[PDB]
Every structure is written in C-alpha cells, then in structure tokens.
Paper text:
Overall, the structures of all the five structures are highly similar to that of the wild type PRS1 with RMSD listed in S2 Table. Consequently, the M115T mutation might affect the A-B dimerization interface, whereas the A87T mutation might slightly affect the secondary structural elements of the N terminal domain. The N114S mutant decreases the hydrogen bond interaction whereas the M115T mutant reduces the residue’s hydrophobic interactions around the interface.
PRPP is formed from ATP and D-ribose-5-phosphate (R5P) by the phosphoribosyl pyrophosphate synthetases (PRSs).
Numbering used by the authors:
A (entry chain B), C (entry chain B), E (entry chain B): 3 to 195, 203 to 317
B (entry chain A), D (entry chain A), F (entry chain A): 3 to 195, 203 to 313
The structure:
C-alpha cells in the first residue's frame, strides 16, 4: 500500500528513508529535455497506493519544485489513493509575508501550486514560520529538529548546563527561549540595525546560535564575532536547514565557530569536504517514522519531543 | 457609488469613518432573535455599488463575526459590485498556528469564512501576524498604527530620546525592535520561564511596553512590575488593540503605568471612565483614507 | 476507527449517544478566552479516524456554531479520515430564502462555513426546509422525528384514531398531511393574516398541532385557543425542536395545551423544571444508530419510517 | 454594451424582450447534428460586453439546458464581461429535495452546471421553491408573476371580491394564502389521500385554482371536479408556468374551467389554437425591465 | 463493495459488463416526465460502496448526458464511497477546441459538468483527442480498442501483412502510423480540401481505413472510392465508435467496403439488421476488466496492448 | 490604466511590445538569491490597473515559469483589476497528454498553476495543441504565426506556387495541410518507423519543413536529408517556436537548409550570429495588438 519516490538524482535522503522503512524507492524515468523541461514517467503502477514523494536535495529550487509538482500530478492522475509531499526544506518559506512592500507571498503561491497539483498531505520539517501550515487547506505535519538538537547539545557540549542559547535575529526569539527553557539555561538575542546589538548575558558561557536555516552565513558569522566580543567562551551554530550558498563555506572556514551543526534536510556531503567545521545530524529516521505513522494512522506528535 | 455599512451596535468608529468620507451609513435593520440568531436586512439597494462593511464592536467575538459574514453574504447576493470587510481587529488572529498542539488554526478558518461569505477585499490593522495575509487568496491591506504610535511617543514622553521599547513576551521581538530602530533607542524583552526574565537595559530610563494587543493584561501588568524592579524611571504601555476584558481595567489602575495608550479599533469610551491613565489614538482617519484610496485606485501603501 | 466529540459542556445528548455506541466521548480542552474567543485542543490523536462532532445544546447560537467549525477544522488538519457534523438542530435554518426582501440566505452561509471548515458529511434532524440539503455539495442525512412522533401519539393519546393533525402555519401543510395519512385521520391548517384562520374540521376531536420547531410559542399558543374555539376537545403540541426562548415558558404555562411534546435535540431539563406541561421524546438512539450506520456503510434510510 | 441572445428555436419571448430594450438579438448559428449534438457558434464579438442569454422553449428540457450551458461557456471563453442566464422556467425546479427517497436534488445539479458553465447572474420567474436561490453562490433575481395575476383576477372575474383561491395540493399552501391575503378573500386546499379531500369553504363562490406550474394537468383537472362537487359557482385555473404536455390540452377542454390563465414563460401559441379557454399573460416586459435594471445598477426589487 | 448501474433502457452493454463481473445491475427507478425531465431513484443503498455508472447507448445525447449526471449526483449525495462514470463514447468529444472560431469547447464543459455532479473517476474508450484527459482534474482511464482492432485484422484479413492502414483525415495520422508500425505495414493519409487528396501507396494492397468514429459516413465512403481509384485491392473501415446517424446506413450499403467494423461502445443491433456489411467487436470484456482492476487497485495499463 | 511588465532578463520582446503601445515597461526589481530563489518586487502601484505580464526568455523554463507565477501573484494581491499572462511559447505545451504512459499532463498542471496564481486571461501564440485552451476555465487567446509565415513564403521563395509543405512527423499533419491549402500547393509527411518514411510528392520542387517548434533539431535535420534524397530542389525549415538548444545550431549549419525561419517568441539574437541561415519574423506587433485589443474590448479574432 506504501510507495516512496524520490526527486531527481540527489536520492541520498530518499534512499535513507526508504531503507529505514524496508522499501526500495519506486521506479521513475526522470530526465530534463534539451530545453530544460522536466519529463517524468512513473515506472510502476501507483493505483490505489499510499504514495510519498520526497523532494530532491538538488540546489536549483525552481527545477526541484517543478519536478515535485509534476510527480504529484502524475501520481494523482494515475489513481494513487493518497499522495503526500515530503518536503524537508519548504521552498520560498522565507517569502511568507509582504513586509510593508508590494511583494508576493511566494510561500502561499508554493502551497497553492502543491494543492492544485493534487497533494493530499504535506510532511515538512521546521517551517521558517509555523503560520505556513495555514497556507494550506490540506493537513500539514511540521516536524521539529528540536529533539535531535537538544540531544546533540547534551552529548557534544560539556558545558551545556551553563550555556546561552542565542537567536541571531528578532524573529528567532520564541525558538531559542523554547530550547533555553527545556535545557534550563539562559537565552540571548542579536538584532541587526549596519550594526548588531546583543541583549542577554553570554559572558564566560558557551554560546549556541540556533536558527532554522543559514544561507550565505553573513549573519551567523557576524553574530559569532559579536558573541566572542561580549565574552562568550566559544560559539556554536546549529541550524536545521544548511543551504550554504555563495560565500558561506568561505565565511564558515574563517569564522570563529567551534562547530556548525546542520541536519541532512539538504545534502551536505560536498559541503563537508570543503568545510571541516560542519557536522550533520541525520533526520532520515524522523522522516521515515512520520511516513510510517502517517500511513498506519499512528501519532506523529510523539516525534515533536522524542527522538525515534 | 461607494456605500459604507456598520456592524451591530458599535457605530462610533463606523460613523467617524462615514463622516470623514462625506457619507451617511447605509440603512440596515440589524438585531438578535430571542433565541440569539442574528437578523440582518439591508435597507437599500446595493446593486452595482462598492460596499464597505466595518466590523462592529459589541465585544462578543462570535456574534460580531457572524453578523459580518451575514452582511457580506446579503450584499453579495443583492449584486453589490464589490464587498470589502473592514476589520480593525481581526477575529481569532492569535490562533494562527498549531503551536505543537492538536489545535485549530482558527485564523485560517476565519479567513475561509470571510472568503466563502463573498468578501473581495479585506482592510485590517496590525495583524497579530503578517502571514495572516496569506490565509486569503483575496487582497488584504494591513494598515499600521506604528506611525501614529511614534508620533504619540515623541509628543508625550519628554525623555523619549533615551528610553527603551520593551516587549512583554518573546513573540513581540520584531514589533519592538522596529519601533526602537525608528526612534534610535534601545530595546529589551521579557520572557516568562513562573518567574519573569528581562534581557536588555532599562536602568534609569523610561520604559515603554509595546504589544499589538492586551486582553486580561496579566502579562503586561506583571511586565510593568519587573521593569520597575529593574530601575525603569517610569513605565508606559502601548497597545494597538485594547480588548481590556475581565480584571484588566482594575489590574491597570493597580499597576504603575504612567499611561496606557490604545487605538479605537475597539470601543474604549466605557473603559476610559473607569480608568484615567488610558489614552486613545483615533485611527478613523487612517481607515477612511484606506477606503477612499481602495475605492479610487489610489496608493494605500502611503499610509504605511 | 470511530471517535465522538461534544461541543461545550451541554454534553447530555452527546453522552447519551456515546453511551449507546459503547464509547467514551473524546478528550477536548475547550475554553472561552477573556475576550469571548473559543480556544480548542483535541486531547487525543484523530489520525485516520472516523470523527463525529455533536454540536452543543448551549443556547448561544453563534458561540455554538463557531466552536463546531473550530473543532471540525482542528480534526481535519489533524488528519482525521472523515469528519461528520452531527447537528440535531440546524442553525439559521429558518433563514433559508429571501422572502421578497434584501435578506441573506443565512442557512446557505452556514452550510458554506461547514463545508470550508472541512465537514465531509452532515447528520441532522428535521431540517426546517428539506431544500437545505441542496445547500451542500457533501452528503446530508436528514433524520425524521416522525416515526418517534407517530409512536408517541399512538401510545399517549387514546383518541388518536379520530384526531386531527393541525399545521400552525401555511408552510407546515405537507408535514401534517403526511402524519394524517399515516395515522389515517384528518388534518387542518391555521394561517395567520393580525388574525388566524382555520381550514379543516376539528370539532369534537382531539387536535394535535405538529410543527418542526417552536421558539417564543406565540403561534402555537394562539393556535391552541383558535382550535378550542373551533370545538376541539383538547389540544396537543408536538415539536421536534424546542427552542422555548424568551416568554415561551410563560406562554405555555398559561396556554390551554394538554401537553407540549418536544425531542431532546435541544436540552430541555431546565425548561421542564419551570414547565410541567412539557414532555420529552429521547432521540439519542436515532442519532446513535445513524452514526453507527454511517460508519458501517449500512442503511440510514431504515430510520425514516422505523424507530430503532 | 448590452447583448441579448436567444436559445434554439423559441424566439418569440426573446424577440419581445429585445424589442422592448431597443435591441436586435445577437447573431448566433445554433443547430443540431444528425447525431443529436448541439452546435453553437456566436456570430459576433462579445468581448467586454454585458451578455444576457434567454433560454429557449423547444420544450425538450435536456436539449434546452445543454444549449444554454454551451452558449454561456462560449460567451465566457470569448471574454464577455458578464453572462446572465435569463431562465423564465428553471429546469428541474421540482427536483429540489430528496423527499425521503434515494433521489437526486437535480435542481442543485442544474445550479452547479450553470455556475461551472460560467454564469455570473441568474434571472428567473416564480421558482417552484424560494430556497433554489440558495443552490447558487451567484446572485439570483427571482421575479414574480403575482402582481400580474392579481391584476388579471380583478379585471376578469366579476365576483372576485368574494371568491376563494384554492391550492391543488398541500405544497401550494403558501402561494395561495399570499394571493388570498392581498385580495382579502378566502383560501382552500386540496389533498390527495386515491380520494381528494378539500379543506376550506368554496360553496356558492368562484373558485380559482392557483399553481406555479401544471404538467399533465391530471391534478388540476381532478381538483376542478372536486371544487364543482363542493358547490363552487365557476372554477378558474391560474398557472405561471404552463407546460401542458401529453393529455393536458384535452383534459383542460374536457374540464369545467371557465378559463386557464398562464404566462408566456413557455410558448403557448400552438396550445391556444387547440384550447380556447387558455389566456396568456405577457411577461416580456417584466423580464426586459429586469435585464435593463440589472444592466444599469437599478432596483429590480421594484418589479416584485 | 462494487455496484454497477445502467443508464436508461439501452442496457445491453451494461448487462454484458455486469455479467462478466458476476453481478446484477443495481435497481434504478428511472422514468422521463411528461415534460421531458428525467426522474431517477436509486432502488438500493449505495452507502460506502464503489459505484460504477455505465452511460446509456440511447441516441439522444443530451438526455443521456443529463441522466448520467443525475445518477452520479444521486449516488454521491447517498454517500457512495466512490462514483466512477463509465462512458464508452465521450459526448461532445469532437468539440474539444475553438478551431479559430468563437466556439465553445463543449467537451470541457461536459468534463466540468461530470466533475461538479461528483464523478471521482472516469473510464472511457478512445477519446477523440487524448488531451481531453486534461479537461479533468480527476483521474481518467482512456482505454484503447487498438489491441482488439489488431486482433480483428490478423484473424479476418488474409493479406494483413501487405496492407496499408489509411487515415481518412489529417487528424488521424498518429493513430494509423501506430497501427501500421505494430503490424509492420504501410500507412497512407487522405485529406479533404471539395476534393480528397491521398498521400501514400495503396496500389494493389488491401486498404484499411481506421478512424476513432464515423457519424454520417460521408468521409469514409468517399475515402473508400478514392482508395479503390488509387488501385487498392479492397477497402475495410474499422471505427471504434459507430454513431451511424442520418444517411450513414444508406451510404454504407452503397459503398464499396468489403466490411465496416465497429465496437459495441454504441448499440449496433438495430443498425446491423439494415446493414449486412457491419461487423461488431465486443468490448464489454475490456470495460469489465478495467472496472475490476479499478476496484481492486490492479493495473489497467495491461489493457492498452493486451486483449483480456 | 494599462500596465505592461516583463520577465527576468529577456526584455527585447517586452520592450518592443511596450514601444508599440506607447508605454514604458513597469518598474520591477527582479533577481535571484545565491540559493536560486526568485525575488520579485513590483516597483509601483498596480491598484485598479489592467496588468499584462510578458513572459521572459532566460531559456530556463522552470525559472521563467516560477518568476511569471510570482509576478502574477504579486499583482493580484496588490489589487490589480485584471492580470493577463502573455506567453508567446506556452511552457510544457508538448506534455498535453499521457501517451499511453504513466505520465503527467504537465501542460494542465501549468494551466492550473497560472490559474491559482491569479491570472484572469492568457495570451499565447501557436499552442502545440489547440485543446490546451480547454486546460483553463479563464479565457485564452491563441494567436497564429500562420498569416506571417504565408507572407514570408510568398515574398522569399520564388518557386512557392509549386512547392510542397512537409511535416517532420505524423502529428504535424493538420498544421501543414492548412498551410498547403491556403497556398494551393501539395503536402507531404515524414514518419520515423530507425528509418524515415516519406508519404507524398516532393520530386523536383522546393520543400518547406513546417513545425510549431524545434528543440535539438534532430528530427528536422534528419527530415531535411530524406527530403533531399527524394529529389527536393531546395529545403526550407519554418518554425514558430525556435528553441534551438544543444547541438541544434551546429546541426542546422551542417544541414542543407536554404533558410531556417523562426519567430521572436524566443530570443534569437545570440543564435543568429552563430547561424547565418536563420531568419526572424517579428511578432511583437501581433502581440501588442492583442494586448491593446484585449484592453479596449476590440476584436482579437481579426489578427487570426
């Protein structure tokens, strides 16, 4: 009844998930035309099946999105019983409001495209904004890396009991206070004005910058300096989504981080070869278990505070 | 061509809006059956007209929402050219995410009810969260009290140039850092572990608590005490949406606030007689201008 | 697979139904904010389940409706397999047409709100107008109190074989002729012009006023007088939905009714303490059985002429 | 700017409407393939125009409905600004509820087909049931023959001031009590147990049978006999929608009716030559005025 | 779980399909009013069932379509689990584009009516244009008579290995080249300008005109003459949908066809009595098997190249 | 009132269109994040305006489609009166059917994305298949290069009166027979069994290969060889949509084409310097006229 498919050929995460569920990834004949159009053919019947499409870790966001939409459509019109999009890193998630400008809410457009392509269910991890669940009328399960983060901290940072959890911006406050409260430690916040201001005590403590994602790493790198100047003993960065585009890998190599921790929601293997500071938390088990629970009608909510 | 209607009994804001636009409120017979059902009867033709329904402030959120939905529907099925809901304080705005709970996203439900009722356009002020705009497929104009708040701060707080804008909670961080930046002053934040924790400096300076809304005022009143303990000269409370229900009005007086500043997005006339430190910023001009500009194809962004 | 939830704390009907199905009502953390906003939290997983939400008997129609919509939404986005609204008394049912005025069809708006909240199915009893089923695109089962009414009449009115079934208005004709034909008796009709006119013979017969609902009871009370003046031996009123708001309980106490019979679609316990003329027909079994049949894929139509 | 098109072959009503509005009917090539498929080809641009399609009276209900849906779609995809279906007699109106059966609500299906075809507005007359308006989310204007029926009664029945308005069935109760009230006369009702039963007084007075529609006229003809047996002076039959199919025309002559009055919502010209007691009320002026008023943002309620 | 219903009283195909599945057709009380309105009543419960409605072979396209829509609606609001329209010959399929005129895309309107009536799935055979599948958002299975055609040819035309497959028009090229390639033979094409032009060699070969449908047969009859004049040994016509309206049966009787082969997607029994040249390929097994596979979640795609 | 915006970087067509209409392109800041996400910011009010977005030609089909969808959405939620997508070459047009495969109908998906993004109207040229219009419920105007192709044939091929219009494949049959009919010349068709097969006569006459589009040009180049082998005097290739990616430009030169004629629905300026036999037909005037006529309620059919 269960059927798992991958996007593109960045199948590492997809294969890890399929492995954990005891399944082979479904056959897809999936190539890009000479004119950059993606052609897809589902190589097996999906009729009456519970289909899960895991979005590729390829960097080109528009290619990845279109491929996903196309595969959703193909499965729907081939009479799949249900089609679930498994989207570890939600595309255009940072474009979720107008911010006083004549801007698109591109995340709402993305949710609309997934809905009209025929998605019945979304599984995602750490949406940049939780309100994005409201952009759909279909159910969304928004998984958290938090339990895996708390675990990583307790086992890797000796001074975790006396550390400060630090938000790199104003929008991350609720997220760091939540980790701070669970660990029973302090929190601090950095706000960029072309200067950063820090509120909260980090003096003579380990500082852990926690964000949902880092892209060019300009922010986390400057925040690390700022934290050291404020007297933090050393600085960690823990992000769920490691985009690391453009100059990021250069910035990290030169930055005063003790370690930069990311999940494998985005493929990190190439980036790790050029950046020794990077460590990866595997989230394939969380994703596999959410898929398993979804299919069985069991509680996905268990995964919100517990690591499977 | 333009027609403005009001919700149930709270006419003050609606009448202020209509006055500024040179218009009388549209005729509507609005009431309640002995069995609590809302009756509404548009008392004039709205065929081919640009209709604006300004949501009532009877305080009872479900009655007010149902009355608005019913008026939208009646206008739509009476062949209005367009219907805009003008909703200064968006119902259920706080319920805009699951929060790790098996909870409704009631703000999205409310957006869907408005859309299915036939609204073509929404005008609102200081949405608890900006993503609520994305809960609709119809255009939403989200007005800001911010410019009127900053004006009031400068014109009423002598020591404003060196004060600190303070958030009652972790979630209000963005709102206070925006205000503090435009003033070029400092910010601080309070978090409830319970015990309250303060990050940032307020010592020997005026503290201004800024929130989008206050309900029971439990948080804002406890916040004010912590601020005083940390050596704030005087403490102010600025709220765009002043609901002030329950113990709120008494809690305010029993608190140290030099003043509690709210907008008239919700009626305050009753709560001002019972609380002397409350001051009101009139936003009827911001809303009238939004309607006029919406009607005329003119830029509403200017009001931001 | 089956899960029953109640609205508010007027859980009598809900508990009766749950009892009959051998179930406990599902856990809900359901409170009203200081600012009259209803906050709801489903206390157990509904993932993959057949959910039934029974609307509260609390009098405040807008609070009750909103609570119901909110619970439907919560269950839908929590991945319930199906969500059925069980709405014994359909709100705003009397606002189902324009009546030559610039009026809302509020019942159509209500049906639209239930549909967008995510209802897949409605179970209701004696819709004021059967056309209201057409206000939905989802299936509606409209149950009838008629079989329970016919039963009540045969067992409580000795002269049932020679009685007259009387409509209190023009809109109730089809409903009374139907009861009249089944009992093989006469029917009559009252029409209010500020005076009532009666067509049909009631002289020296027991008269039974049958309506779908009574609210302030102005109409049924005046109809009872009118029937006695026409020479009816005595008068009964049988309504399915007993709203009894405002002066109703005063009007009934002073009216010349032998008995006023209602169902428990709306809670009557408080109203009975102040009004001895009221008797209640329990419809929990009809509702429980429709829920049971719905869930099993069995015939709900059996209940249209038969009392379970 | 306004453009009026007609259905297949029944042009009389459509042409009457267009004449009153000072307009020629729009060019359309409408036919049927040898294999019964409806072909339609709008013969002029309707881009940016206010288009009114008046439904045809070829009698064949499914052909007429499909032709209307196709014309609506063609106008919509040719970028008409707005499309109104003008449907004097709403197809499948009688099928508006399940009636305790595993039955379709075909009137709702018809409403959905119209909506999906692209209709923005409906104009109709004497909907079998008023709730049918709620089967749509688009505006519906439901016109009344009532004022024209009352005029005709007074102007044609000498003894009208003391007559009785009678319903052929239990379901027509509201329709007859409304007419009887405005005239300040009595009403009565017939119900089929079969044997027919009469409630109300008709003795030594003129009886007027009033229904929204009559098909085979079995009910209305049997009703007329019962009324005569109960001592009605003379019996009239008033029907807004006169379908008169099958044995109806013969059954009418073979019956006692002093007259059978219908509107021209359905063509009657053929059925008037075969039945002399039939009289027609022209409703083209009511419909033209509704279109003109719909077009101009003027009050259609006035016509009620 | 499976339930099959027919439209009207042209139940031959429907009965054949029901037979092959081991089922009796469901009870329907289905009559036309004196005013040409179709009244329908489903005589048994369809609650929770997998419903298949097979569209009648009656000639009156609008009556047939409306009846089908009405039955779909009736089953949907009676809480069928799924409703599938089985439409062997898709109505208004030839009206699937604007053709430079101010024309309706009537096939898109038809697909929209089926969707709003509540169809969850369509089963059809040889859509005039495959793009018509794109007119729906629900899944469409478009079955092919091709495997049954190839079989008929191999067993009935001795010279099949040296024949020419001929398109009667420009729009049929892809269809004939496909049959030609599978049989490993030649293809040709006729194009009407008031004259026909033929491209491709048919000299001294058997010619097989293959089209999706024939209506008045003006085209195929003229094409047959043209093919004989070009030196074809003899001419066959194989259509999937035999409408044969108006003068068709007269035209065929006088035309130089060796045989005219059609499927029973449309009833042919009456037409065969007046036209001896007509032979019928039974497609009830293909339809029955697609229904069986649909219901079971098995591969319908097997039927695209294989005859069951 | 009318406002014209362009996609990312391909401005040439958009600027040609705006020039012909007497308009400057609307201000928009359009770019790409380091992480490939499309950023778009409408730089002026479009409230109450008739907005036309002309799709960009950066070649990367998914980037171009996403940028278009985002611009449509931004214009819609900024209260544009109407949004038209002007898409000379419809993305994924070739994927308009399953073709017996478990395949997407990606053209329908694309139509749905455009519709959900908020497009009210589409203008496009030479849809690969005419049924693609039915993939929408909004109006689509499908313009033709045909009249401009026929003009070019007569004005550039001396021996056109006795030439043969040839299809590269079985599917292009209708397109070539239409062209051949209007010219009153012959047609032929090529099919790939592989070995290529030719039906129809091309001996000692000029052969014109006509397709709606060519990508790698593998088919069209192999077609040209077969035509020469069959004794065609000279061979031309006419394509409304010239994608010309990969080996195409080299394959063309290495082929026998006297000329390869395309429209500028896709930029060609780079591919003309690298290939001398390419000629371009400007279609900016056809598209400008369609926008102007769409805006003014005038007949676009005239351009067909």
């Amino acid at each position: 009844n269960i059927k798992i498919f991958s996007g593109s050929s960045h199948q590492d995460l997809s294969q890890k998930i399929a492995d954990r569920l005891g399944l082979e990834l479904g056959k897809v004949v999936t190539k890009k035309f000479s004119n950059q159009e993606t052609c897809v053919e589902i190589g097996e019947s999906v009729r009456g099946e519970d289909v899960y499409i895991v979005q590729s870790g390829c960097g080109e966001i528009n290619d990845n999105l279109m491929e996903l939409l196309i595969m959703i459509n193909a499965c729907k019109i081939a009479s799949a019983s249900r089609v679930t999009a498994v989207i570890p890193c939600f595309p255009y998630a940072r474009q979720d409001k107008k911010d006083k400008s004549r801007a698109p809410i591109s995340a709402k457009l993305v949710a609309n495209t997934l809905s009209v392509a025929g998605a019945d269910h979304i599984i995602t991890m750490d949406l940049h904004a939780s309100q994005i669940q409201g952009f759909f009328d279909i159910p969304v399960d928004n998984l958290y890396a938090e339990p895996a983060v708390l675990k990583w901290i307790r086992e890797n940072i000796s001074e975790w009991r006396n550390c400060t959890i630090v938000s790199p911006d104003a929008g991350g406050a609720k997220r760091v206070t939540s980790i701070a409260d669970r660990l029973n430690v302090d929190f601090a916040l950095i706000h960029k004005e072309d200067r950063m201001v820090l509120v909260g005590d980090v003096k003579d403590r380990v500082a852990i910058l926690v964000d949902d994602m880092a892209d060019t790493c300009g922010t986390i790198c400057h925040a690390a300096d700022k934290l050291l100047s404020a007297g933090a003993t050393r600085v960690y960065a823990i992000l769920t989504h490691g985009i690391f585009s453009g100059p990021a890998i250069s910035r990290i190599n030169n930055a005063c981080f003790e370690a930069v921790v990311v999940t494998n929601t985005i493929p990190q293997e190439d980036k790790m070869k050029h950046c020794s500071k990077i460590q990866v938390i595997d989230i394939s088990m969380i994703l596999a278990e959410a898929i398993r629970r979804t299919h069985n009608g069991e509680s996905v909510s268990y995964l919100f505070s517990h690591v499977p």
